[PDB]
């Protein structure tokens with residue numbers, strides 16, 4: 001109860017910023033996460049012993065893939081922590097508890113393959129869940145680990161609150177299906193411009209939480225250029241592996257995933273910042289003004305990719 005997790009000075013300060021990188025020391029990421037729960041939610045909200053057992057089982061269930069790994073889980077949870085701390089009074093005690101857990105678990109047991117590949121391979125998970133295939137898996141895994149012994153970190157919640165928080169986590173995880181993002185932002189933009197957006201409408205909160213989730217999940221594009229540049233390697237290493245597996249099924253993959261078309265990447269990153277990332281942080285800044293740093297940093301990197309194309313690096 002009196003055991004305040006503290007970080008070294010540079011981490012204690014840099015962690016409050018949106019562009020924080022959690023660094024190369026795996027063994028520190030669990031301390032970083034707990035520190036974020038304690039600051040974001042209270043020393044009270046979870047039982048330190050049960051939390052630690054839960055974190056470690058979740059770590060154990062992320063795989064050794066180039067990008068969709070434990071480090072991504074904790075990076076996405078850090079961004080969410082940054083948003084919650086910069087919007088201190090907009091969110092309930094339960095949302096804060098559930099949203100940091102949703103992010104840590106959002107990519108549980110990812111193998112580095114898109115829903116498309118699962119469908120074209122005819123993976124058993126594609127029979128079980130037709131849409132948002134991996135995302136229903138990730139939630140289903142979160143529920144599994146919650147149900148292990150000494151792992152129920154929500155035990156002190158009523159039956160009501162327990163169902164509300166698991167329903168926050170489910171929508172949160174589902175919303176990381178980028179196919180769902182496009183229509184979700186369209187609707188939030190229209191509600192905001194015609195002034196009908198209302199954070200008491202549970203239907204509207206749900207949409208806003210989904211957009212935060214897209215924003216946290218994309219947050220590699222909001223880091224300082226050297227971090228963004230080096231993460232793109234990890235992202236594309238998974239893309240090229242999936243393309244290889246597409247070719248193995250007798251299917252020319254889209255160029256994004258074709259490793260023979262490495263040369264087309266910088267223009268592909270342009271597409272994605274213009275079509276996906278910039279729109280995402282624009283609409284999110286309109287709803288939650290204090291998240292502006294993510295937009296600025298995203299623009300900064302869009303600009304860094306244009307420099308790549310113009311042979312200035």
Ligand SMILES: O=c1ccn(-c2cccc(OC(F)(F)F)c2)nc1-c1ccnn1-c1cccc2ccccc12
Nearest residue numbers: 113114115176178217218219220221235256268269272
């Ligand atoms: O640089 C990029 C170029 C293209 N896509 C992309 C486009 C279209 C569908 C798409 O998802 C799919 F691969 F499942 F098909 C990814 N994403 C990124 C990117 C930047 C930061 N994160 N990130 C992501 C990399 C890999 C899975 C991501 C999943 C969701 C959001 C961002 C994901």
Ligand SMILES: [Mg+2]
Nearest residue numbers: 106107134176
């Ligand atoms: Mg995912």
Ligand SMILES: [Zn+2]
Nearest residue numbers: 072106107217
């Ligand atoms: Zn993710």
